[PDB]
Amino acid sequence: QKGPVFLKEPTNRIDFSNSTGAEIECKASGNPMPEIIWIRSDGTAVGDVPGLRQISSDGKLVFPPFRAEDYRQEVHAQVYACLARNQFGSIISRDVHVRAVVAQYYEADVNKEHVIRGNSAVIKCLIPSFVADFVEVVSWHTDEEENYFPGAEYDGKYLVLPSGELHIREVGPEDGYKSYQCRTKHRLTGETRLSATKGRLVITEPISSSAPRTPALVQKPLELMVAHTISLLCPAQGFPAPSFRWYKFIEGTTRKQAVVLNDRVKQVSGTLIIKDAVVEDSGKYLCVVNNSVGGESVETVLTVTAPLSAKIDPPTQTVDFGRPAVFTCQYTGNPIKTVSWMKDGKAIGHSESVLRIESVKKEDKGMYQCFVRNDRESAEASAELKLG
Amino acid sequence: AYFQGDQKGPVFLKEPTNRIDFSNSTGAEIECKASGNPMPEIIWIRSDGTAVGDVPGLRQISSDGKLVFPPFRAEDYRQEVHAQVYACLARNQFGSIISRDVHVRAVVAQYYEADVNKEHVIRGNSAVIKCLIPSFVADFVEVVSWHTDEEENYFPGAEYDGKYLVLPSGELHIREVGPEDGYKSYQCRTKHRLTGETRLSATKGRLVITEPISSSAPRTPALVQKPLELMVAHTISLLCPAQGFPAPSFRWYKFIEGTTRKQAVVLNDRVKQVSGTLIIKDAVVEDSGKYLCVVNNSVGGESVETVLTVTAPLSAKIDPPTQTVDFGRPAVFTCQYTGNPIKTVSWMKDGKAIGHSESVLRIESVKKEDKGMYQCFVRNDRESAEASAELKLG
Ligand SMILES: *[C@@H]1O[C@H](CO)[C@@H](O[C@@H]2O[C@H](CO)[C@@H](O)[C@H](O)[C@H]2NC(C)=O)[C@H](O)[C@H]1NC(C)=O
Ligand SMILES: *[C@@H]1O[C@H](CO)[C@@H](O[C@@H]2O[C@H](CO)[C@@H](O)[C@H](O)[C@H]2NC(C)=O)[C@H](O)[C@H]1NC(C)=O
Ligand SMILES: *[C@@H]1O[C@H](CO)[C@@H](O[C@@H]2O[C@H](CO)[C@@H](O)[C@H](O)[C@H]2NC(C)=O)[C@H](O)[C@H]1NC(C)=O
Ligand SMILES: *[C@@]1(*)O[C@H](CO)[C@@H](O[C@@H]2O[C@H](CO)[C@@H](O)[C@H](O)[C@H]2NC(C)=O)[C@H](O)[C@H]1NC(C)=O
Numbered sequence: 001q002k003g004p005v006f007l008k009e010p011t012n013r014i015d016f017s018n019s020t021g022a023e024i025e026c027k028a029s030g031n032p033m034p035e036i037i038w039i040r041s042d043g044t045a046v047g048d049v050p051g052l053r054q055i056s057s058d059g060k061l062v063f064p065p066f067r068a069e070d071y072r073q074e075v076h077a078q079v080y081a082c083l084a085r086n087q088f089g090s091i092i093s094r095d096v097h098v099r100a101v102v103a104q105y106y107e108a109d110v111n112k113e114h115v116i117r118g119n120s121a122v123i124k125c126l127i128p129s130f131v132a133d134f135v136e137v138v139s140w141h142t143d144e145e146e147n148y149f150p151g152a153e154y155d156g157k158y159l160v161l162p163s164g165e166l167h168i169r170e171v172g173p174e175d176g177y178k179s180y181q182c183r184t185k186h187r188l189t190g191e192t193r194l195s196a197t198k199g200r201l202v203i204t205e206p207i208s209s210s211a212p213r214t215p216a217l218v219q220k221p222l223e224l225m226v227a228h229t230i231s232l233l234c235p236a237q238g239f240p241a242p243s244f245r246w247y248k249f250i251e252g253t254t255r256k257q258a259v260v261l262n263d264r265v266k267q268v269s270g271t272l273i274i275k276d277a278v279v280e281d282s283g284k285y286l287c288v289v290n291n292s293v294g295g296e297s298v299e300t301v302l303t304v305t306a307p308l309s310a311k312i313d314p315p316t317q318t319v320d321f322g323r324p325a326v327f328t329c330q331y332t333g334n335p336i337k338t339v340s341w342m343k344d345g346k347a348i349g350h351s352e353s354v355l356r357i358e359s360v361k362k363e364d365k366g367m368y369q370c371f372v373r374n375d376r377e378s379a380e381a382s383a384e385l386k387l388g
Numbered sequence: 389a390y391f392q393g394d395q396k397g398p399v400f401l402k403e404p405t406n407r408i409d410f411s412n413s414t415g416a417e418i419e420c421k422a423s424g425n426p427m428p429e430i431i432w433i434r435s436d437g438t439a440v441g442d443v444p445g446l447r448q449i450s451s452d453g454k455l456v457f458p459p460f461r462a463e464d465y466r467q468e469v470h471a472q473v474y475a476c477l478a479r480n481q482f483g484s485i486i487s488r489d490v491h492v493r494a495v496v497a498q499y500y501e502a503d504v505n506k507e508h509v510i511r512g513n514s515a516v517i518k519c520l521i522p523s524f525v526a527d528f529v530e531v532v533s534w535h536t537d538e539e540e541n542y543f544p545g546a547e548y549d550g551k552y553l554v555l556p557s558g559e560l561h562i563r564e565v566g567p568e569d570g571y572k573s574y575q576c577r578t579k580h581r582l583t584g585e586t587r588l589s590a591t592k593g594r595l596v597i598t599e600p601i602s603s604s605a606p607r608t609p610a611l612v613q614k615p616l617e618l619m620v621a622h623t624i625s626l627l628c629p630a631q632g633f634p635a636p637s638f639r640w641y642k643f644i645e646g647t648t649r650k651q652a653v654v655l656n657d658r659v660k661q662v663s664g665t666l667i668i669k670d671a672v673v674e675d676s677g678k679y680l681c682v683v684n685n686s687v688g689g690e691s692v693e694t695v696l697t698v699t700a701p702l703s704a705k706i707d708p709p710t711q712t713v714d715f716g717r718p719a720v721f722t723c724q725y726t727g728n729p730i731k732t733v734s735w736m737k738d739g740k741a742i743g744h745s746e747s748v749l750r751i752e753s754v755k756k757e758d759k760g761m762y763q764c765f766v767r768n769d770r771e772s773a774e775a776s777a778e779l780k781l782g
Contacts, residue, residue, distance in 0.1 A: 018602075068601050077603040077687045102601035111505050112591070114522040128508035129607040129631050130598065197506070204524065207496040209467045213523045217611035220692075237523045293471045298614065 003091075003316075003367045003384040004034040004084040010061075010096040012377055015134070017188040018066050018102045025059035026093060028084030037083040041095055045083075049075050061096075068102050076100035083345055089367030090345040094378040101188055106131045108184045110199035115171050116210075117203050118241040120269040122233065123166040125182035125195055137164030138192060139183045159268055162231040167271060168201070170241075175201050211294035212238035221301035223376065226334075228277050232300050234270035234287035244270030247286040256286055279304045279334045308333035308379035310370050316384040322359025327383050329353045329370030342369040360387065391426040396710075397485070397761045397778040398428035398478040402453070404490045406771055409528070411582040412496045413459050420453035420476035420487060428478040435473040435489055443469050455490075462496045470494035477739060483761030484739040488772040495582055500525045502578050504593035509565050510604070511597045512635040514663040516627060517560045519576035519589060531558030532586065533577040553662055556623040562595070563663060569595050605688035606632035615695040617770065620728075622671050626694050628664035628681035636685040638664030643678040650680055671698040673728045702727035704766045704775035713754045714782040721749040721777050723764035736763045754781065 008027035016022045028034045038046045038061050046061075048054050052075050054062045061080065077100070082093035109126040127135045140148040140160055148166060153159040159167045166180065179198040185191070214236050224230045234244050246267065247256035259265060259272065266273045270289065274281055282304040288297045310331040319325045329339060331353075341350045344366040348355075357364055365387050371380045402421035410416045422428050430453040432440045440455075442448050447469045448456045455474065471494070476487035503520040519531045534542040534554055542560060547553045553561040560574065573592040579585070608630045618624045628638050640661065641650035653659060653666065660667045664683065668675055681692045705724045713719045723733060725747070735744045738760045742749075751758050764775045 071601050073603045073686065077605075100602060104598065104601065106508075106598070107596075109506050111520075112503055114500075114524075116524055126505075128598070129609055129629075130508075130510055130600065130604050130633075132607065202501070204498065204500070204522075206524070207462045207465055207498065208494065209465075209471045210524055211471075213526065214614075215523060215611075216613060217609075218614045219610055220612045239524070293467065 001088055002031040003088040003382070004028050004030040004086055005382060006082075006084065006091065006093055006380075008059075009093045009380070010080075010082055012094060013097050013099070015099045015101065015188060016063070018068065018071065018100055020188070021065040022063040022098070022100070024061040024096060024098075026061070026082035026084070027059060028091070030084070030086045030088065032086050034084040034086040037085060039081050039083055039092075041079040041081050046080065052076070063098070063100060066100075071100065071102055088384070091367050091369055091382045092342065092345050092380070094371070094380055101134065103189050106135065107196035108135065108182055108193070109197040110180050110182060110195050111197065112200055112202055114202045114204065116237050116239050116241070117172060117205050118239075119171060119237050121168045121171045121175075121201050122235060123168070123180050123199055123201070125164060125184065127184065131186065134186050134188050135184045136187070137182050138185045140166045141181050141183070141194075143179045143198070153268065161233075161271060162229045162273065163233070165233070167268060169269060171201055171203060173203055173205070176203050206239045208239070209293045210239045212236040212242045212289040212291060212296045214289070214296050214298050218298050219300050221303070223303050223305055224277055226277055226279060226304055226306050230274045230277055230281070230302060232272045232285060232287070232302070234272075234289060234298060236270060236289040236296060238289070238291045238293070240291045242289050242291040244290075245288050246272050247288065249284045249286065251283055259285070277304050279306050282334070303335055305374070305376070306332070306334040308336075308372050308374065308377055310372050310379045310381035312368070312370055312381045312383035314383065316386065318386040318388050319360045320388040322361060325357045325360050325364065325385055327355040327368055327370070329355075329372070329381060331370070331372045331379065333372065333374070333377075333379065335374045336372055337374045338372070340371040340373065342371065343367070360385070362387070393425055395480070395482045396423075396425035397482045397776070398422045398424035398480055399776055400476070400478065400485065400487060400774075403487050403774070404455075404474075404476055406488060407491045407493070409493045409495065409582060410457070412462065412465070412494055414582070415459040416457040416492065416494070418455045418474075418490060418492075420455070420478070422453070422478035422485070424478075424480050424482065426480055428480040431477040431479065433475050433477050433486070435475055439477070440474065446470070457492070457494060460494075465494065465496055483778070485761050485763055485776045486736065486739050486774070488765070488774050495528065497583055498525075500529065501590035502529070502576055502587070503591045504574055504576055504589045505591070506594055506596050508596045508598065510600050510631050510633050510635075511566060512564060512633070513631050515562045515565045515595055516555075516629060517562070517574050517593055517595075519558060519578065521578060525580070528581050529578045530581075531576050532579045534560040535575050535577065535588070537573040537592070547662070555625040555627075555665060556667065557625045557627070559627070561662060561665060565595055565597055567597050567599065570597050600633045602633075603687045604631075604633045606630040606636040606683040606685050606690045608683070608690045608692050612692055613694050615697065617697045617699050618671050620671060620673060620698055620700045624668040624671050624675075624696065624698075626666045626668075626679060626681075626696065628666075628683060628692055630664060630683045630690060632683070632685045632687070634685050636683050636689065638684075639682045640666050641680045641682065643680065645677060653679070673698050673700050676728070697729065699768070699770070700726070700728035702730070702766050702768065702771050702773035704764050704773045706762075706764060706775040706777035708777065710778035710780065712780040712782045715755065716753045719751040719754050719758070719779055721762050721764070723747045723766065723775055725764070725766040725773065725775075727766065727768070727771070727773065729768045730766060731768045732766075734765045736765070737761065754779075756781070
């Protein structure tokens with residue numbers, strides 16, 4: 001006899017268009033071979049909604065394409081999980097957050113950017129918050145028919161930044177005779193679109209000096225996957241045109257250290273570009289900006305995320321009554337907000353990485369699971385307790 | 389050739405203020421006035437320590453503590469005169485004292501324009517139309533009113549038709565946006581505090597309403613409000629921008645200082661909530677803290693932390709005024725400061741820094757050279773305050 005074990009866990013987030021639908025597969029092994037059950041993560045096994053959700057063979061949670069008119073929050077905006085069960089015990093998979101999106105019109109805008117002659121400028125493509133999870137910038141274009149793409153800086157002046165903005169170096173009066181528009185792509189429909197307004201730089205020739213001034217609204221804490229490229233903006237306008245330096249606070253201290261620039265880590269004006277993120281790049285960054293009148297600064301936190309995995313030591317044990325049983329969950333990833341245990345699909349209230357039963361009983365036989373979580377993600381491991 | 393009484397060190401009777409901001413057409417008078425026996429000399433220094441020269445037409449030191457910045461032509465701006473922190477230095481035979489810093493900022497009258505763009509919102513949600521003012525005039529310009537193409541006019545104060553509110557921060561708040569709400573275009577009126585000029589936005593904004601089919605948990609934006617410094621006694625509005633379908637609800641908490649624990653904000657007379665916006669009237673220092681907006685809906689939710697500091701004017705005071713001490717007996721000065729934040733304390737003796745940052749100063753054993761004036765300086769980011777005291781030999 002062997003308890004269930006997942007062979008294929010459903011992914012964590014599945015987002016899809018109503019025209020595309022969604023197959024989600026859950027595969028499990030055991031001896032006897034286990035039954036698969038889908039549940040809402042309110043605990044309840046899920047029904048079939050003809051046309052909308054059909055549990056199939058032998059995973060297998062299918063969402064067929066549907067009409068706007070048949071959208072249903074209860075089915076289509078939902079967190080699910082997979083439950084594999086046999087005589088020996090049950091295991092739950094991680095959560096599967098299901099988001100079906102009815103394909104709808106939107107439009108990105110580019111507005112006027114005001115800047116002091118000689119400063120760098122950042123033109124932003126405005127995307128409404130309710131498509132921003134799905135829409136991203138593919139390219140920039142001007143009325144003079146030039147086209148800018150992510151990659152390298154053009155003519156020492158134009159760079160399309162990782163976060164999709166257009167960065168322009170050393171803005172002069174001649175730069176006001178240009179109008180900019182972005183191209184956006186929606187990842188669920190694959191549709192692309194030119195922005196519905198276009199923006200211009202309005203340049204001031206200043207007479208007075210002015211210390212550097214940064215905006216009221218600042219980038220909130222970023223979460224970036226390992227091996228990805230990151231750009232941190234340091235918006236500032238000053239006269240004379242300022243200098244910019246970046247730091248990282250030593251983690252949990254009030255001290256900071258200059259960022260070192262190389263191959264991998266580059267600074268374009270005041271923008272820090274970090275290629276190939278490793279978890280160690282996480283931290284609290286400070287941009288200090290300066291000219292002969294004075295200085296200002298803004299902070300920006302970054303977490304470099306790494307995918308969770310867990311494994312319990314040992315994968316199985318046979319323990320006498322009422323001797324102790326000990327399970328140790330080992331995991332990998334960044335960040336780890338919590339560790340949680342289950343027994344035959346239910347919670348046990350125990351959030352330390354090591355589980356100890358002091359003296360085993362009849363009812364302790366079954367499957368145990370460690371779940372590790374951070375706010376975008378989860379990983380489970382399972383283990384088997386038998387009675388001597 | 390002459391004075392009576394014991395010599396008394398100098399002491400400021402009129403301290404110059406901290407920031408004077410002024411247009412090129414107005415100019416600036418800054419007055420420093422001090423006391424002592426005998427009767428002290430007044431010298432203006434730049435805040436690298438050097439005593440300042442006259443620049444005819446620009447900077448003239450006058451009778452009888454007065455630094456004067458006459459009205460001047462654009463062509464005549466000199467950053468060295470016009471963008472500068474000064475101090476007042478007052479001296480007599482007995483000793484010397486330096487005033488708190490005096491940040492001087494002359495600003496040449498220049499054209500700017502505000503803008504108001506398209507705002508995209510889910511029907512049924514609230515919306516916040518913003519007046520985009522250019523960073524480099526934003527210290528001097530702010531919103532005075534909102535106006536519509538159907539000729540309606542909204543002022544700071546009270547809600548209109550329970551629907552439109554001009555937030556104390558200048559944004560126009562609108563409740564429960566409906567499709568009919570897309571046939572309105574909005575402009576801001578802004579006022580420049582140094583020229584007193586008023587203008588309307590160069591561009592007008594509109595609402596673009598999405599009639600959504602799929603549900604969406606609440607979504608907050610990438611860029612969020614950085615830490616805010618509000619003067620005591622002022623009104624404050626904190627925003628929680630979020631769009632969601634259904635229409636989400638909003639709740640405000642405040643963290644217990646230096647813990648991970650929050651408490652619900654208690655809404656009443658003086659603290660109110662419009663949709664997701666928190667309004668704090670008549671701010672006290674105690675209102676300072678880390679605040680958290682939770683936002684919700686049957687699909688899931690989100691949140692935005694914002695830090696508020698309510699600031700209070702800094703003032704310092706030494707105990708005593710003056711003491712006489714025999715040689716090899718210790719002397720003791722204690723600074724009593726009020727205000728919010730204090731970031732730092734420091735000390736000087738006869739205009740020079742002594743490198744000592746604790747509220748109470750102690751000379752272990754008084755020598756000949758220790759006679760004279762001693763000063764505490766208490767500063768934050770935006771402000772400074774000084775105190776003085778007189779040490780005599782017995
Ligand atoms: C999913 O929803 C979309 C949007 O409601 C449907 O697409 C519409 O299809 C009609 C023709 O069938 C077009 O004329 C419209 O242009 C589409 N609307 C928009 C705004 O995109 C789509 O067919 C639905 N998918 C299904 C039923 O499989
Ligand atoms: C560049 O600008 C910054 C102003 O933000 C200066 O850094 C500050 O320096 C003062 C002391 O002179 C400190 O008390 C502040 O805390 C500093 N801010 C921080 C934490 O960066 C800096 O002095 C300027 N560069 C120079 C040396 O001219
Ligand atoms: C301060 O500078 C402003 C701008 O240069 C001056 O105002 C201008 O005055 C000229 C004539 O003197 C006019 O043609 C402009 O239309 C004005 N423009 C602005 C921007 O107001 C002002 O006179 C200066 N202060 C002085 C000379 O005392
Ligand atoms: C609409 O969204 C918000 C997002 O927070 C949800 O509120 C969460 O409330 C539960 C209460 O037990 C907490 O576990 C969460 O921690 C809250 N927020 C977070 C991320 O910490 C809520 O799920 C949504 N709908 C409602 C009202 O239930």
